[PDB]
Write a protein that binds this ligand. Structure first.
Ligand SMILES: [Ca+2]
Ligand SMILES: [Ca+2]
Ligand SMILES: [Mg+2]
Ligand SMILES: [Mg+2]
Ligand SMILES: [Mg+2]
Ligand SMILES: [Mg+2]
Lengths: 241, 240
């Protein structure tokens, strides 16, 4: 196991970029103007949190607001996990293009080569660049499970790459499966241009934040972020029974 | 006096970025992957032109496709002019957010500090960043003169900065005035946060291409670009 990382943001000052992360803010990797005087930012906030005093607050829209972690070389799989609290919903949303909260990217400079989880065409799901292909197919658009605004959610994304006949992704909300990609028919536009191994070269950086391709501004808070190459799950506290 | 530049793209090979220019492609300055293999690019094209063999061809959308050039230190005003041919129109367009063809920017790496001329809220006009203000005001949105698709146009933008009480911008189509920013009431949202000197710091680079904030893909061709600190207008051949 090459990575087993957790961050509750408790050690960073309020209004500062999380210590130990990079950023991708307003389309620039490690934007030097990620601060409280800007309209788009990714900063520690002590006004909402799932555990302890602090979370990370993403304020963005069309312009992305993200924190970025470098992943170890040669991962075949990765698990991204966080407590997530959003100003708006994902899923079952008319007129959506696509929006995402979680992802991985191959090149730090670009949003050009990456896998993007949140919603596509108003269903919870995934956009890949550079194909710009989307999952699920048209059939399911503007429907399906909702990730509600204004409440804390335990979101896990499992990405299974490496030496397997078709690369997979499964997303879970409070430990319930909500979205899967496990064959080529799950994509709308012919399956990432025929490519069965569609996570190859994607697993270099992990990112978290807000990025709307539907022209929607949002405020998103996350806490207790985890990144691992072994499965991650949510505890009863996180499930909020 | 400080700049008098022209480019018809005739010396650059087809499918190559225009010689002597930088780029802003896919939100990256001097993107190394500005080439005919990509879905977003700014490349010389000999299949359409206004004069000679060649034009520059911008293919982009929400992801920008632009060529960029430095401007000399000290400019207090600039004129941007080009023959322009576009796959869609600007102006009189319901549902538009904003889209632009011409601009100037302060910092090469970002689209974060710049004046954007094309349409705002479906009326020919201007967006400034970082204020995100727009002109004209809301009374005129989704109306006004059209810059039509599928035909060659001569577009000129005058930007008047430096030591004057209020910075100004005037845009012209085939020598007819189509848009003006003369005073603070021309802005929708309070006038660039009350800054009268709103061109200051903006005249470091000129840029041209296609950049939509309305999620519209386009192809745009330009030729016979001029950039000067002295006025420019369209000649007899350009008016057609
Ligand atoms: Ca915390
Ligand atoms: Ca030419
Ligand atoms: Mg919950
Ligand atoms: Mg845990
Ligand atoms: Mg004409
Ligand atoms: Mg001339």
């Amino acid at each position: 196991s090459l990575i087993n990382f957790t961050d509750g943001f408790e050690s960073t000052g309020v209004n500062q970029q999380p210590s130990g992360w990079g950023n991708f803010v307003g389309w620039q990797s490690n934007n030097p103007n990620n601060n409280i005087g800007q309209s788009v930012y990714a900063l520690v906030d002590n006004t909402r949190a799932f555990t302890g005093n602090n979370s990370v607050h993403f304020k963005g829209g069309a312009a992305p607001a993200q924190i970025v972690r470098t992943l170890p070389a040669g991962l075949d799989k990765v698990y991204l996990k966080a407590m997530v609290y959003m100003s708006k919903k994902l899923g079952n949303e008319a007129g959506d293009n696509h929006e995402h909260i979680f992802g991985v990217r191959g090149n730090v400079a670009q949003a050009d080569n990456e896998v993007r989880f949140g919603q596509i065409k108003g269903h919870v799901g995934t956009n890949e660049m550079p194909s710009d292909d989307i999952s699920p197919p048209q059939s399911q658009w503007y429907s399906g499970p909702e990730i509600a605004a204004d409440t804390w959610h335990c979101v896990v994304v499992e990405m299974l790459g490496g030496n397997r006949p078709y690369h997979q992704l499964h997303a879970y909300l409070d430990n319930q499966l909500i979205h899967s990609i496990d064959s080529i028919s799950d994509w709308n536009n012919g399956g990432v241009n025929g490519n069965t191994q569609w996570l190859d070269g994607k697993l270099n950086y992990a990112f978290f934040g807000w990025h709307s391709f539907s022209n929607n501004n949002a405020d998103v808070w996350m806490d207790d972020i985890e990144i691992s190459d072994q499965p991650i799950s949510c505890d009863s506290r996180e499930l909020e029974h």
